[PDB]
Design a binder for this molecule. Structure first.
Ligand SMILES: C=C(/N=C/c1c(COP(=O)(O)O)cnc(C)c1O)C(=O)O
Ligand SMILES: C=C(/N=C/c1c(COP(=O)(O)O)cnc(C)c1O)C(=O)O
Ligand SMILES: CC(=O)OC[C@H](N)C(=O)O
Ligand SMILES: CC(=O)OC[C@H](N)C(=O)O
Lengths: 306, 6, 306, 6
């Protein structure tokens, strides 16, 4: 009987869809993480961070969840499904529909100033006298990459029958590309190309790897470009870094909608734009490129996407 | 400040 | 290789989630059709109606799709994915986010007057000099119930290991409960209880079956309560009809969100409210009740749901 | 007219 005891266990098994108007002869395939319990890739880590914290006793009945953040919407539905209280912090700058959703899920919301971005959101460590609160810390909590190592990567391996050659993923916390790369490279033993994507507006991974001045900047690609290197980004399994600009990312997401019939978020367009560039290099012509589409476009109705 | 820079 | 050639083939395989704060000792289970390509149950019929129309030559390159309508958003992403033009009609009264979504998908939109409702929307048969246009007619097109007979019903049978005793579904076109009931009753041979749900504001199925005056009325449960008996509702496999009021349906959807962590639409709350009532009858105590949750709550952010 | 009646 495939009946889940609560919504948190229904995470993953997202589909692979071949692109028709990007890439070269179908070499670009997308993984639609929009099709998850709270409709983003973060559902996977919202569940596992809560699960793991239960497993080692730091999360118990009567403790209240805290973190800074789609991760919020993920933790909120998990908190609701499993019966936890939850306070959150989010940059004010994020789309209204994720603001609106959190309130309906029972969250104690606390917006933070947009100019300070995620660093400002992480005004959350402030929040956690302990004993009552527990902060889950998505940017460094290893339970974030390991759910991707346990489910998302294996889903990609199985659905491609081991044929995946390249994985393209935008980087926020870095959990996705880390767990996925570790699974396919270390668990399944295949030397793929792991491609991190970041905004050209805030290319801190590129600058770091080049031994250059780290200069983050503001951008419109919600989800990625934290402005620093997160602990949950394993630089050692990253083979390549692609940068993408906001306008192109937006245009690409619109194209996914109107030309492919795929309802994808802003960061999904960035990831595909990056993948499309690699896919049109002759060196990648015989390569199957798998691209993570982290979220769905209805969570961006209030944004420059529409 | 769009991103934001943090 | 589980890679879909376009987004239309990725329909279905939606999850079953056990409810914790409804029913009696876990006898109520929900099927989350929010987890579909365009995030509603209608994805299934958007795909199959287009597929079937291709298969018998009425839909060809250069023909333009028409119908009246979530079905719109379903046909739109399929039209985009497979390369068809599409005009639609929808009652003005429907949520803004489904209006907004259609435009981004490439649709030629035409809103109709709310007081006239769906009948008014079906100002669409108007639209189809033929030869160019083809109307798919979801309220009578048999390809609507048969995709539910081919996928949704079998998904329910398999995931419950044949243990499903009751299926609760709201009725719009009637395609869902018809195909599902036919599958489980005729294909798998199990005499379940098929429960149609309609608004108490517009109980035309109840009135018809009672041989009483059919008096439809206005209501807030988007998706169901067309105000007439659709051809795609097979009355012969309907064992029971439950009515639910708008306020209770809204309250139930909010509860699903805040207490179960399930992001469900307005009609999903109606279906669960009906199921909950049956589930608390001693005659249904040893019965596994499966409830269709047709859509997801972010498509209702502009509604009385929020 | 909410539904609407049609
Ligand atoms: C950091 C989170 N978002 C992750 C994310 C990402 C990046 O995924 P990883 O964190 O696993 O790198 C990409 N695109 C979108 C829309 C995302 O929400 C958050 O919701 O706070
Ligand atoms: C008639 C359509 N909707 C079907 C529907 C239904 C009813 O499903 P069936 O048409 O299969 O009966 C229930 N709830 C929601 C939200 C729905 O969108 C339409 O989108 O026009
Ligand atoms: C969705 C949100 O803004 O969070 C994304 C991620 N925390 C980041 O670096 O922005
Ligand atoms: C979502 C929409 O309004 O359509 C639902 C269905 N056509 C009905 O009877 O209302």
């Amino acid at each position: 009987m495939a009946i889940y005891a609560d919504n948190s266990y229904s995470i993953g098994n997202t589909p692979l869809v071949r692109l028709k108007h990007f890439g070269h002869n179908g070499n670009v395939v997308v993984k639609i993480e929009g099709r998850n319990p709270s409709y983003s890739v973060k559902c996977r880590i919202g569940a596992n961070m809560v699960w793991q914290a239960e497993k080692d006793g730091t999360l118990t009945k009567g403790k209240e969840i805290v973190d800074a953040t789609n991760t919020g919407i993920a933790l909120a539905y998990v908190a609701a499904a499993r019966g936890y209280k939850i306070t959150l912090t989010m940059p004010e700058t994020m789309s209204l529909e994720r603001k609106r959703l959190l309130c309906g899920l029972g969250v104690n919301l606390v917006l933070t100033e947009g100019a300070k971005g995620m660093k400002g959101a992480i005004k959350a460590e402030e929040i956690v006298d302990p004993s009552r609160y527990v902060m889950l810390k998505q940017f460094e909590n290893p339970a974030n990459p390991q759910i991707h190592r346990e489910t998302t990567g294996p889903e990609i391996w199985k659905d491609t029958d081991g044929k995946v050659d390249v994985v393209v993923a935008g980087v926020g916390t870095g959990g996705s590309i880390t767990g996925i790369s570790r699974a396919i490279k270390l668990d399944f033993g295949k030397q793929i190309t792991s491609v991190a994507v970041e905004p050209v507006e805030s290319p801190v991974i590129s600058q770091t790897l080049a031994g250059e001045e780290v200069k983050p900047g503001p951008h419109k690609i919600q989800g990625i470009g934290a402005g620093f290197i997160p602990k949950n980004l394993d630089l050692s399994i990253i083979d390549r870094v692609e940068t993408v600009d906001s306008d192109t990312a937006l245009a690409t997401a619109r194209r996914l909608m109107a030309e492919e019939g795929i309802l994808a978020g802003i960061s999904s367009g960035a990831a595909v734009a990056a993948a499309d560039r690699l896919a049109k290099l002759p060196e990648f012509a015989d390569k199957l490129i798998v691209v993570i589409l982290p979220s769905a476009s209805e969570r961006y109705l209030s944004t420059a996407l529409f | 400040f769009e991103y934001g820079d943090g």
